[PDB]
């Protein structure tokens, strides 16, 4: 096949990376593996290092004149590419071996293990009112050559490359998502019983969702309107828990449920970005440079609950609100995931 490449501005330093996207299987993530090309006499005294830094970057990098990133370093690791280190961990891999065969002796292997307790590539949508790019957790691989780790950064030395960490749907479907609500009155024995059920717990982007809602209005009040919407929750954790919730798609129908009556229906609602181009705070899946994408892919948590809260977490929920006459408004909420299938 092919291999992506990036070279230093000087042209003496070049790094070859096996893949641009990385995937996790909920127990082991595919290791980040690459090789670096360098001609020794250019440095002749220095050493070569590669860094995988994950940052809570804000704004952009195109020399924009504005308050730039709060550059919190979530997790940083180091590896001495040159001079050569012990063989681990553990071999040069098949791609590494093939690149060494292709190039020869001027390549140097480096290896990396992404801990399972790290976030997923997410990017907040930049608001039109502000300028430039917006904040969002992102990965980065930076290869630099220097005598010391703390030696000053040089543009000709350091080479910058961007990677993404995304998840793929498990093949095992989960339990049926459903809920119920029985709302009585303040004193009278009449009540209001409603039912909500879903087609599935997993969906693909653009694929419509048919919510199965049923109402048993064996009561005295009248239902004025039914509100159907899907809510997005973005758990942000830098050093304190935060939660910026925002709706993405809402559909309404002027249907009236009379007292002492039953009413059930199915509604079609689709989460899509075309109608929410301006809403600041919406979460989008990680971009490469600036290209568009879908909505933020729902991030499933591992079985062992631990914490995993070291970045941006996103989840989706659907709520149906029943507008009951002269008070007594009640709504039903329900969770579900929404993210890509397994490619080939």
């Amino acid at each position, epitope marked *: 096949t*092919r291999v992506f490449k990036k070279s230093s501005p000087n042209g003496k330093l070049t790094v070859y990376l096996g893949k641009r996207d990385f995937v996790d299987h909920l127990d082991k993530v595919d290791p980040v593996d690459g090789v670096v090309l360098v001609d020794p006499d250019y440095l002749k005294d220095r050493k070569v290092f590669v860094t995988l830094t994950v940052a809570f970057r804000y704004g952009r990098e195109d020399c924009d004149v504005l308050g730039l990133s709060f550059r919190k370093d979530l997790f940083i690791a180091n590896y001495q590419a040159f001079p050569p280190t012990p063989n681990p961990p553990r071999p040069p891999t098949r791609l590494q071996e093939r690149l060494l065969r292709k190039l020869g002796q001027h390549a140097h292997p480096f290896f990396f293990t992404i801990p399972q307790n790290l976030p997923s590539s997410v990017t907040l949508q930049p608001g039109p009112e502000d300028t430039g790019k917006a904040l969002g957790v992102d990965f980065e691989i930076r290869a630099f050559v220097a005598k010391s780790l703390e030696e000053k950064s040089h543009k000709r030395n350091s080479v910058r490359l961007v990677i993404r960490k995304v998840q793929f749907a498990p093949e095992k479907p989960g339990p049926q998502p459903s809920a119920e609500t029985t709302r009585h009155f303040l004193m009278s024995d009449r009540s209001l019983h409603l039912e909500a059920s879903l087609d599935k717990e997993l969906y*693909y*982007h*653009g*694929e*419509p969702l048919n919510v199965n809602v049923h109402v048993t209005n064996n009561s005295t009040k009248t239902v004025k309107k039914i509100k159907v919407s899907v809510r997005q929750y973005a758990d942000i954790v830098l050093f304190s828990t935060a939660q910026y919730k925002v709706p993405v798609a809402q559909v309404e129908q002027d249907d009236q449920v009379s007292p002492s009556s039953t009413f059930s229906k199915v509604y079609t609602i689709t989460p*899509f970005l*075309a*109608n929410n181009r301006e809403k600041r705070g919406l979460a989008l899946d990680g971009k490469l440079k600036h290209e568009d994408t879908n909505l933020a892919s729902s991030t499933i948590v591992k079985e062992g609950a631990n914490k995993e809260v070291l970045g941006i977490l996103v989840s989706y929920r659907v709520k149906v609100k029943l507008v009951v006459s002269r008070g007594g408004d009640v709504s039903v909420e329900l969770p579900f995931v929404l993210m*890509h299938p397994k490619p080939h």
Partner: antibody, heavy 119, light 109 residues
Framework: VQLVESGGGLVQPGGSLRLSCAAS????????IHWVRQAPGKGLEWVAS????????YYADSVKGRFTISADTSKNTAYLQMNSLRAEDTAVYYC?????????????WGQGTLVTVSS | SDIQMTQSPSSLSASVGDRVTITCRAS??????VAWYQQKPGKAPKLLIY???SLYSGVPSRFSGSRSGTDFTLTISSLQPEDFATYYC?????????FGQGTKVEIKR
């Protein structure tokens, strides 16, 4: 899953026409609609495309401005209106579908209809 | 800008069970967004190769594709007697997409 068209015929040059392709068995938002034309005995070439999920539109340079494209999510139907027709625009027209995530070719092709412009 | 293709040969003839190679060349570099399309005379076309190496579902394995820089190789192992038609080449990572000029394949006698 199927794909059907309707709206072919003969149009006076300097006139206008409107074509439709109804989609069934798949989802409009999780897909995209592209049209390509093929002159008789020539190689088929791309004309227009609409991306409902992104709310974006595109057109060929030779037919920029002259053509429009629209989509209706209620009936799972796409609509495009042809204006300022010229004698060279006559060809056979097709409606096509493609996976939105991601672009992987044009898996389904309609039965196709022809457009003739003459006096 | 306009990324024009240049295929060759425009036409060729073969027989049953022959090795047939048709080449697609691109005026610029395209990574993998190249597809192979076959169109029977008078009917709707249909995809054969997408992503420049994958064989689409519902297609006999006798078809195969290959890439070499800006040159693309499309081969058939044992040409079945109902495959005689035209073939089309396209690249689709730049807007707009561009198609080939048609390549006729027919039986020899």
């Amino acid at each position: 899953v199927q794909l059907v068209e309707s709206g072919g015929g003969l149009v006076q040059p300097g006139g206008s026409l409107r074509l439709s392709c109804a989609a069934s068995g798949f989802n409009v938002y999780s897909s995209s609609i592209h049209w390509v034309r093929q002159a008789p005995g020539k190689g088929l070439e791309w004309v227009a495309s609409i991306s409902s999920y992104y709310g974006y539109t595109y057109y060929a340079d030779s037919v920029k401005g002259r053509f429009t494209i629209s989509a209706d999510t209620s009936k799972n139907t796409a609509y495009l209106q042809m204006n300022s027709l010229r004698a060279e625009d006559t060809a056979v027209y097709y409606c096509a579908r493609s996976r939105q995530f991601w672009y992987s070719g044009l898996d389904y092709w309609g039965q196709g209809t022809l457009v003739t412009v003459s006096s | 800008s306009d990324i024009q293709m240049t295929q060759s040969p425009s036409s060729l003839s073969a027989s049953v069970g022959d090795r047939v190679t048709i080449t697609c060349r691109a005026s610029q570099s395209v990574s993998s967004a190249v597809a192979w399309y076959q169109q029977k005379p008078g009917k709707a076309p249909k995809l054969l190769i997408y992503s420049a190496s994958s064989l689409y579902s519902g297609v006999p394995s006798r078809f195969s594709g290959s890439r070499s820089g800006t040159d693309f190789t499309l081969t058939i192992s044992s040409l079945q007697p109902e495959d005689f038609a035209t073939y089309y080449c396209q690249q689709y990572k730049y807007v707009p997409v561009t198609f080939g000029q048609g390549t006729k394949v027919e039986i020899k006698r």
